[PDB]
Amino acid sequence: MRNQELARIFEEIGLMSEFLGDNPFRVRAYHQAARTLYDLDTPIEEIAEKGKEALMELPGVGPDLAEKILEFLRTGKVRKHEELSRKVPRGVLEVMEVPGVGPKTARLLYEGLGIDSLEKLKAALDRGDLTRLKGFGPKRAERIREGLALAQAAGKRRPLGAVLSLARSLLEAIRALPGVERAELCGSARRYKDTVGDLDFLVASREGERAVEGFVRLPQVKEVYAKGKERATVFLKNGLQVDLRVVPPESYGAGLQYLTGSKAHSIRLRALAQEKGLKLSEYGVFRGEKRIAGETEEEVYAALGLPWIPPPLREDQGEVEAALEGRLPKLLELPQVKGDLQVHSTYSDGQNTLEELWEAAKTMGYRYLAVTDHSPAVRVAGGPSPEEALKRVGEIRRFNETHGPPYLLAGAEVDIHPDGTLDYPDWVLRELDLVLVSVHSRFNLPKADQTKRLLKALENPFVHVLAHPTARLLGRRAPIEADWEAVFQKAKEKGVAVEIDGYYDRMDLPDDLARMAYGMGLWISLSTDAHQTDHLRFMELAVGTAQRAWIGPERVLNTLDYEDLLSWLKAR
DNA sequence: GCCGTTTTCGGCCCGACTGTTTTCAGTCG
Numbered sequence: 001m002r003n004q005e006l007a008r009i010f011e012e013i014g015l016m017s018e019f020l021g022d023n024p025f026r027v028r029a030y031h032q033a034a035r036t037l038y039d040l041d042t043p044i045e046e047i048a049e050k051g052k053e054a055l056m057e058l059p060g061v062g063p064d065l066a067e068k069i070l071e072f073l074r075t076g077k078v079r080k081h082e083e084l085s086r087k088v089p090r091g092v093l094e095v096m097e098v099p100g101v102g103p104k105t106a107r108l109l110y111e112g113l114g115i116d117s118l119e120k121l122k123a124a125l126d127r128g129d130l131t132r133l134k135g136f137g138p139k140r141a142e143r144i145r146e147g148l149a150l151a152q153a154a155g156k157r158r159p160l161g162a163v164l165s166l167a168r169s170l171l172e173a174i175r176a177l178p179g180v181e182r183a184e185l186c187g188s189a190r191r192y193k194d195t196v197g198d199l200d201f202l203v204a205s206r207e208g209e210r211a212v213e214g215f216v217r218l219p220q221v222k223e224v225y226a227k228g229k230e231r232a233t234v235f236l237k238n239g240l241q242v243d244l245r246v247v248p249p250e251s252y253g254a255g256l257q258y259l260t261g262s263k264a265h266s267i268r269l270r271a272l273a274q275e276k277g278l279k280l281s282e283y284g285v286f287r288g289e290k291r292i293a294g295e296t297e298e299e300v301y302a303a304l305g306l307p308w309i310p311p312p313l314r315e316d317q318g319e320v321e322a323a324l325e326g327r328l329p330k331l332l333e334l335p336q337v338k339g340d341l342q343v344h345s346t347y348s349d350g351q352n353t354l355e356e357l358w359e360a361a362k363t364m365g366y367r368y369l370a371v372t373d374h375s376p377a378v379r380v381a382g383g384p385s386p387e388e389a390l391k392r393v394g395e396i397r398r399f400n401e402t403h404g405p406p407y408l409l410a411g412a413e414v415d416i417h418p419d420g421t422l423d424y425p426d427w428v429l430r431e432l433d434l435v436l437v438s439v440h441s442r443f444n445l446p447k448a449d450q451t452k453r454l455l456k457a458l459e460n461p462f463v464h465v466l467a468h469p470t471a472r473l474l475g476r477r478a479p480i481e482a483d484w485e486a487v488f489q490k491a492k493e494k495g496v497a498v499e500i501d502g503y504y505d506r507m508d509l510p511d512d513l514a515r516m517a518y519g520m521g522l523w524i525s526l527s528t529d530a531h532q533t534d535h536l537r538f539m540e541l542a543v544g545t546a547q548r549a550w551i552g553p554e555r556v557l558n559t560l561d562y563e564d565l566l567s568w569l570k571a572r
Numbered sequence: 573g574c575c576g577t578t579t580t581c582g583g584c585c586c587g588a589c590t591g592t593t594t595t596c597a598g599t600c601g
């Protein structure tokens with residue numbers, strides 16, 4: 001991938017232009033193209049390999065954001081970006097990333113106190129300079145200090161799974177606040193986006209001041225950036241930004257739509273409303289002053305001539321077009337999943353025994369659970385050897401016969417060597433119920449080699465699932481360089497399923513690689529990669545990722561019952 | 573700079589919070 005650089009490059013063209021006072025809509029052309037490319041997990045040049053007049057087609061991208069890309073790879077750099085660089089100091093971009101700052105304030109600060117970096121800004125307030133500026137007051141200076149200090153505690157975006165459980169605690173607390181008729185977790189959290197920038201809570205209330213004052217009073221709250229009658233922005237005792245939005249109960253449905261987004265999806269709907277002479281806000285759909293919809297989401301979407309769109313689809317990735325023409329995808333649902341196909345145990349890196357896993361699986365209402373432990377490669381040991389994997393399969397057999405349902409499947413997560421060979425001999429793989437293969441080494445391999453390595457792993461006829469394929473770690477490590485079309489092509493042809501690993505720091509396949517695979521007709525496997533019984537609660541996230549990728553119950557191994565899973569497995 | 577089951581040109585989402593703004597601009601979701 002190289003989206004991460006080019007996402008920053010347009011983001012910079014937009015910001016430098018925004019500083020120079022450019023056409024705001026041209027500015028927004030870049031900002032959007034920045035957001036979609038960074039969110040794009042399928043490598044861009046793999047899509048750009050066919051660009052040309054078909055680059056005029058991509059997503060949120062037109063002809064002008066193409067000849068610049070024609071230029072980009074032809075010459076390594078876009079003149080527009082370089083032209084803007086000469087007019088706008090590199091450090092002013094950093095200053096206007098500070099929440100509350102923006103173009104006009106960054107410019108005033110530059111021409112006023114010559115501030116052109118965070119380091120300089122930091123010095124300016126500590127010294128107390130901005131409280132002297134002509135127009136920039138002492139109150140407006142405290143505003144900057146807030147935003148400057150509050151940008152730091154909230155470091156990176158956080159994986160959804162890292163904050164999920166906390167989010168539900170806060171939700172249950174907000175539902176118990178006086179004045180709160182009804183509350184819900186919206187924003188990116190509700191769309192199951194693999195990472196979040198904050199947590200966005202909507203509240204139905206008729207005494208909104210009470211609820212906001214009640215919300216900020218929660219013990220996890222550390223600071224308050226902004227606080228009004230209807231909304232508040234706060235940061236927790238751990239850095240995580242949390243926003244509250246209050247709306248009257250009559251507009252609850254329009255409030256859910258508003259706070260759930262995405263921005264881009266929301267803008268499609270409002271733009272649509274304009275075509276039909278209507279207005280869409282948080283308060284409802286309106287024809288003139290007459291509110292035609294608001295109480296619920298269903299009827300709000302109906303007001304725009306649309307069926308209800310599930311939150312995970314709301315990324316303006318074709319869900320609106322598919323809603324107009326009445327062909328929304330049928331989506332997987334959590335109760336349809338009848339087991340977890342990658343959990344670990346005390347046999348290797350897990351914290352749990354078979355009894356502990358079985359008990360956890362039964363409690364959740366699972367039909368089965370695959371106990372897949374690491375191959376020797378994880379440590380490179382010689383005893384634990386391949387010999388005693390048979391006794392492990394034997395021990396799990398007797399466990400099933402004595403306990404009954406749910407059933408433990410004897411599995412294994414087998415390392416893929418740098419050449420594509422597997423960490424376990426074939427006779428060991430032959431007698432395993434579930435065989436997962438995955439990469440835990442040599443990530444910097446060139447695209448072509450990493451493809452060959454993966455392809456040879458798929459030629460092994462005992463392989464059932466290709467586990468967390470990209471090998472990424474959210475915040476720690478990028479995806480491996482690989483031609484994923486060829487890899488999914490091969491896996492399909494060999495009947496191997498691709499894994500959506502719901503473990504909080506993996507979330508791999510990502511939504512849009514998952515949507516690609518499933519679109520090609522591949523089978524899918526869902527797991528949590530659990531090392532403690534807590535982790536089994538991540539199935540929700542793999543499902544949500546499945547949902548984001550327009551994936552239904554068809555060709556998903558977890559929706560099969562115990563018997564049908566074994567058939568599928570026993571028939572290689 | 574994108575973009576068209578009412579458009580290939582003329583628009584481009586809508587409203588809350590903050591500050592020194594006496595009538596609204598800046599920045600944000």
Ligand SMILES: Nc1nc2c(ncn2[C@H]2CC[C@@H](COP(=O)(O)OP(=O)(O)OP(=O)(O)O)O2)c(=O)[nH]1
Pocket residue numbers: 186187188189193195196197198200258259260261262263266267585601
């Ligand atoms: N109409 C409209 N809605 C917006 C705009 N910006 C944000 N929203 C809505 C959509 C989602 C909701 C929360 O905004 P966030 O900034 O939290 O974005 P998010 O979608 O939750 O993602 P993130 O994980 O980055 O927070 O507010 C906008 O410019 N216009």
Ligand SMILES: [Mg+2]
Pocket residue numbers: 187188189196197198199200
């Ligand atoms: Mg959010």
Ligand SMILES: [Mg+2]
Pocket residue numbers: 198200243601
């Ligand atoms: Mg937010």
Ligand SMILES: [Zn+2]
Pocket residue numbers: 413438467468
């Ligand atoms: Zn693994």
